[PDB]
Amino acid sequence: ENIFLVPLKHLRDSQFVGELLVGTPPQTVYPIFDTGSTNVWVVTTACEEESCKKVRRYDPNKSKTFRRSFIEKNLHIVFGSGSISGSVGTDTFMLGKHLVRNQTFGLVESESNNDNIFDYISFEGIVGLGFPGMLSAGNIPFFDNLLKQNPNVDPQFSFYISPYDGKSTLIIGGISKSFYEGDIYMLPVLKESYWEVKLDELYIGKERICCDEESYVIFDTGTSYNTMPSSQMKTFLNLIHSTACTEQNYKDILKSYPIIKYVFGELIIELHPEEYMILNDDVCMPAYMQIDVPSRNHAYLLGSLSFMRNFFTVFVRGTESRPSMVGVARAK
Numbered sequence: 027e028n029i030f031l032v033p034l035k036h037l038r039d040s041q042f043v044g045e046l047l048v049g050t051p052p053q054t055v056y057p058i059f060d061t062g063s064t065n066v067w068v069v070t071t072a073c074e075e076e077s078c079k080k081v082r083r084y085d086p087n088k089s090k091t092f093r094r095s096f097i098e099k100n101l102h103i104v105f106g107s108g109s110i111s112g113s114v115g116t117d118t119f120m121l122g123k124h125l126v127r128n129q130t131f132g133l134v135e136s137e138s139n140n141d142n143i144f145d146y147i148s149f150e151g152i153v154g155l156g157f158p159g160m161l162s163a164g165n166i167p168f169f170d171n172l173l174k175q176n177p178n179v180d181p182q183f184s185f186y187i188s189p190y191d192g193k194s195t196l197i198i199g200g201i202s203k204s205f206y207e208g209d210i211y212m213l214p215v216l217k218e219s220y221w222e223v224k225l226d227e228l229y230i231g232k233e234r235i236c237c238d239e240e241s242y243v244i245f246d247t248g249t250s251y252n253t254m255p256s257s258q259m260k261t262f263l264n265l266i267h268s269t270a271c272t273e274q275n276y277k278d279i280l281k282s283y284p285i286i287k288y289v290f291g292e293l294i295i296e297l298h299p300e301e302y303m304i305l306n307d308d309v310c311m312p313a314y315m316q317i318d319v320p321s322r323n324h325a326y327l328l329g330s331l332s333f334m335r336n337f338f339t340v341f342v343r344g345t346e347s348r349p350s351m352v353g354v355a356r357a358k
């Protein structure tokens with residue numbers, strides 16, 4: 027079909043960046059591809075923080091096709107511990123040789139100096155891939171606009187994450203058994219804002235910690251760590267502690283620690299210790315954090331390095347003839 031591939035680079039932390047061209051003649055940026063948001067942000071030459079001067083900065087004055095917005099302004103977003111601010115504009119984008127004209131985006135003009143998250147990462151922008159309901163500026167999100175202008179591309183994208191060999195890639199318009207084995211298990215999206223599906227049960231080893239009431243998983247490629255709500259996290263940290271992981275005993279800990287099982291009807295997503303434990307300098311720490319999502323507080327995030335390396339994930343946008351779905355398959 028019209029399927030095409032966008033190579034992905036893992037820099038540090040977890041977030042995955044790909045090549046995006048902006049403007050005429052094209053300027054190159056390497057934004058995060060984020061299923062947890064919907065806007066496009068691009069770091070520009072108006073940002074004079076040192077955390078901005080160190081990265082590639084888009085210059086809107088060098089783009090023939092850039093049109094600054096007169097009526098939309100003062101776009102501001104919290105960015106983890108940090109925050110970004112800027113203005114609104116429109117330009118032509120290119121992703122994997124596919125053109126996207128008249129695309130509205132945020133121009134970063136200021137990054138917080140809070141430690142300071144922008145010092146730990148190499149941030150050049152964000153391509154949001156969530157649903158239209160989270161769009162802040164402009165009247166059409168990036169992926170929606172690309173599909174409108176490339177109508178033979180099927181409305182879906184998938185992430186193949188293989189950081190051990192630099193072979194990670196974002197696939198648009200379809201899927202391939204080059205990246206997965208077994209069946210694809212389709213999970214219906216319940217609410218079209220985040221890619222959010224029903225979670226039936228969650229086990230830590232043999233201990234069921236969920237669910238007696240409707241609960242949710244959000245597939246968020248912009249998060250590094252998987253999450254649990256407050257109550258389950260107290261259970262988790264009583265069951266799973268940081269531990270010495272030296273050359274002598276780390277394989278022992280990876281075999282011994284419990285498997286975490288997410289149950290979605292027939293699909294069981296299993297995370298082994300090698301997935302959710304982070305080895306750093308002779309110590310293993312569990313890669314889970316406490317996140318409580320308002321309406322909710324029954325939402326669990328699944329994101330990047332730990333989970334997506336072992337599971338090929340397919341994001342199927344609903345159309346006039348099908349609902350939105352998340353497909354999960356065993357990676358490789």
Ligand SMILES: *[C@@H]1O[C@H](CO)[C@@H](O)[C@H](O)[C@H]1NC(C)=O
Pocket residue numbers: 127128175
């Ligand atoms: C871009 O915008 C101009 C003016 O608003 C319009 O005439 C043109 O058709 C648009 N192009 C696309 C591909 O939407």
